[PDB]
């Protein structure tokens, strides 16, 4: 049984969205002085689906969110030819072909993202071909159920943030992640605005629950080092992406301070790429997203490396392409969970494109031991809200 085709489509949301607000989420563009929504270039109002079909009609479903139209071009023009005609079960070799043939320009970023979408599809395909859930092929059930942390709580008025925290608490979660809305340019006043909101969330979820904090590459080494001592009293479980992805040295410096655990990796690429974060102890928690880092083939290898180093792997984003990996490794304790929501930043956009991603129940997710593949299908429920290009 050989692969016959690779169908890649870009889905562009054209339905209503939540209007952007200022001091909502710190980001890498804050350092500039551009007008408008600072999250503009980071929102996901587009998504990519990648369907790999074999001669017998079986179809595997992969996906990606980073620069969809460009990633699609890479898949169509460069990678599809390296995949078509191959046995899905030569997945490691197929992965290596893409990685090496395009090494000059694709080892990180666009290239690796395209590899990710294809690879995820190939795994869904393999699972379907042998009638096994992807997580079973990866090792099976290491957890009776997957705990998740509520991931949202963007910065806003104290009233709005506490209102959301109260609502989130009703979900039964024992961990919550909130975003900062102020950074370096805001100086000390901004530091106080940040601390006031960390405290506000703590007032609602209390100290019997975990609180993770998200910077989304919006701070820098200097500001982050000065914030750590101020954040420690609030006992955050981790501080995510305090610096831009290129500043790995900064990550290592911050993490070695042992004031507040540093997490990151959603913007790191390839097995070696993540292996470096692990070996250099750049992070206390690794958060690659399988649809960016290189796919399930790469993520499985990364999980082995992180497990040996005993650095927890908690993938970025709550989707089946991550849940299956987490289920199969003891060093993957919990998953990130983006609640179903209106199209805001876009992390929830996949809920409108796919059917099958589990929803949290009392703070836990579950996988089906018998459902082959990833257990997802492309949805036709919101076609009227999308402009799909092929």
- The stretch near a copy of itself (CB under 8 A) out of 2-10, 17-25, 263-271, 338-346 is 263-271
Identify residues 201-240 at the interface with Mg ion (CB under 5 A).
240
Minimal distance, residue 139 CB to Mg ion, in Å: 26
Site for a copy of itself in 42-61 (CB under 8 A): 42
The entry of a copy of itself, Mg ion, none that residue 221 binds, CB within 5 to 8 Å by partner kind: a copy of itself
Please identify which residue in 62, 181, 184, 372 interacts with a copy of itself, judged by CB under 8 A: 184
Has 86 been labeled as part of a binding site? no
- Beta carbon nearer to Mg ion, 125 or 239: 239
Partner interacting with residue 330 (select from Mg ion, a copy of itself, none; CB below 5-8 Å by kind): a copy of itself
283 lies in the binding site for a copy of itself (CB under 8 A): no
Q: Is residue 214 annotated as involved in ligand binding?
A: yes
| Minimum distance from residue 19 beta carbon to a copy of itself (Å) | 20
304 binds, among a copy of itself, Mg ion, none (CB under 5 to 8 A by kind): a copy of itself
Residue 244 interaction partner, one of a copy of itself, Mg ion, none, beta carbon < 5-8 Å per kind: a copy of itself
Active-site choice (267, 316, 321, 324): 316
Complex with a copy of itself: residue 87 or 382, whichever CB lies closer: 87
Among 7, 73, 382, 385, binds a copy of itself (CB under 8 A): 73
Cα 320 to Cα 317: distance, rounded to the nearest angstrom: 9
324 is catalytic: no
How many other CB atoms are found less than 10 A from the CB of residue 149? 22
Residue 106 as a binder of a copy of itself (CB under 8 A): the answer is yes
Rg (CA), the chain: 20
Interacting partner of 250 out of a copy of itself, Mg ion, none (Cβ under 5 to 8 A depending on kind): a copy of itself
Residue 105 in contact with a copy of itself, rule: CB under 8 A: yes
Annotated binding residue 240: yes
The option from Mg ion, a copy of itself, none interacting with 159 (CB < 5 to 8 A, set by class) reads: none
SS3 per residue for the chain: CCEEEEEEEEEEECCCCCCCCCCCCCCHHHHCCCCCCCCCCCCCCEEEEEEEEECCCCEEEEEECCCHHHHHHHHHHHHHHHHCCCCHHHHHHHHHHHHHHCHHHHCCCHHHHHHHHHHHHHHHHHHHHCCCEHHHHHCCCCCCCEEEEEECCCCCCHHHHHHHHHHHHCCCCCEEEEECCCCHHHHHHHHHHHHHHHHHHHHHHCCCCEEEEECCCCCCHHHHHHHHHHHHHHCCCEEECCCCCCCHHHHHHHHHCCCCCEEECCCCCCHHHHHHHHHCCCCCEECCCHHHHCHHHHHHHHHHHHHHHCCCECCCCCCHHHHHHHHCCCCCCCEEECCCCCCCCCCCHHHHCEECCCCCECCEECCCCCCCECCCEECCCCHHHEEEEC
Min CB(25)–a copy of itself separation in Å: 13
Residues numbered 233-262 forming contacts with Mg ion, rule: CB under 5 A: 240
326 and 315 Cβ atoms separated by less than 8 Å: yes
Ranges within 349-368 binding a copy of itself (CB under 8 A): none
Closest separation between CB of residue 379 and a copy of itself, Å?
Answer: 25
Contact of residue 297 among Mg ion, a copy of itself, none (CB under 5-8 Å per partner type): a copy of itself
Which residues 289-328 are close enough to bind a copy of itself by CB under 8 A?
297, 300-302, 304-305, 307-312, 328
Binding mask 120-149 for a copy of itself (x = CB under 8 A): ----------xxx---xxxxxxxxx--x--
- Which residue bears the tokens 């000390």? 188
With the C-alpha atoms ordered 381, 6, 323, 254, is the resulting torsion angle positive or negative? negative
Q: Does 96 bind a copy of itself (CB under 8 A)?
A: yes
Whichever of 26 and 329 has its CB closer to Mg ion, that residue is 26
Beta bridge partners of 337: 150
Residue 383, Cβ density class (10 Å: 0-12 exposed, 13-18 middle, ≥19 buried): exposed
Q: Using CB under 5 A as the criterion, which residues of the chain lie in contact with Mg ion when the complex forms?
A: 240
Q: Which parts are annotated binding residues for Mg(2+)? A: 214, 240, 266
> Which of the residues are catalytic?
316
Annotated binding site: 214, 240, 266
């Amino acid at each position: 049984m050989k692969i016959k085709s690779v169908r890649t489509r870009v889905w562009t949301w054209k339905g209503p969205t939540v209007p952007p607000q200022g001091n909502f989420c710190t980001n890498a563009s804050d350092a500039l002085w551009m007008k408008g929504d600072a999250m503009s270039s980071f929102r996901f109002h587009q998504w990519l689906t990648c369907e790999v079909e074999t001669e017998d009609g079986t179809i595997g479903i992969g996906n990606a969110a980073l620069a969809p139209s460009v990633v699609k071009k890479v898949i169509d023009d460069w990678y599809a030819p390296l995949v078509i005609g191959e046995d899905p079960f030569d997945y490691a070799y197929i992965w290596e072909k893409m990685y090496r043939r395009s090494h000059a320009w694709g080892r990180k970023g666009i290239g690796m993202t395209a590899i990710s979408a294809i690879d995820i599809a190939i795994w869904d395909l393999m699972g379907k071909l042998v009638g096994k859930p992807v997580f079973k092929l990866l090792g099976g059930r290491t957890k009776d159920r997957i705990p998740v942390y509520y991931s949202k709580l963007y910065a806003g008025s104290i009233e709005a943030m506490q209102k959301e925290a109260e609502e989130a608490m009703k979900g039964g979660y024992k961990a919550f992640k909130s975003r900062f809305g102020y950074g370096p340019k805001d100086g000390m006043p901004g530091m106080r605005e940040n601390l006031k909101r960390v405290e506000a969330v703590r007032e609602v979820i209390g100290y019997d629950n975990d609180l993770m904090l998200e910077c989304y590459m919006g701070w820098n080494l200097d500001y982050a080092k000065r914030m750590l001592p101020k954040l420690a009293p609030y006992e955050p479980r981790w501080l995510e992406e305090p610096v831009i992805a290129d500043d790995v040295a900064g990550y290592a410096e911050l993490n070695a301070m042992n004031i507040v655990p540093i997490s990151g990796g959603e913007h790191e690429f390839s097995v070696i790429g993540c292996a470096e974060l692990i070996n250099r102890k750049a992070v206390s928690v690794l958060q690659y997203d399988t649809n960016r880092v290189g796919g399930i083939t790469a993520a499985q290898k990364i999980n082995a490396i992180a497990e040996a180093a005993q650095i927890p792997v908690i993938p970025h984003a709550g989707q089946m392409h991550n849940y299956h990996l987490t289920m199969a490794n003891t060093n993957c304790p919990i998953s990130e969970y983006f609640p179903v929501f209106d199209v805001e930043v876009g992390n929830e956009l996949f809920y409108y494109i796919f059917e099958g991603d589990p929803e949290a129940v009392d703070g836990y997710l579950q996988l089906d031991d018998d459902l082959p593949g990833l257990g997802i299908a492309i949805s036709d429920k919101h076609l009227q809200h999308f402009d799909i290009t092929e």
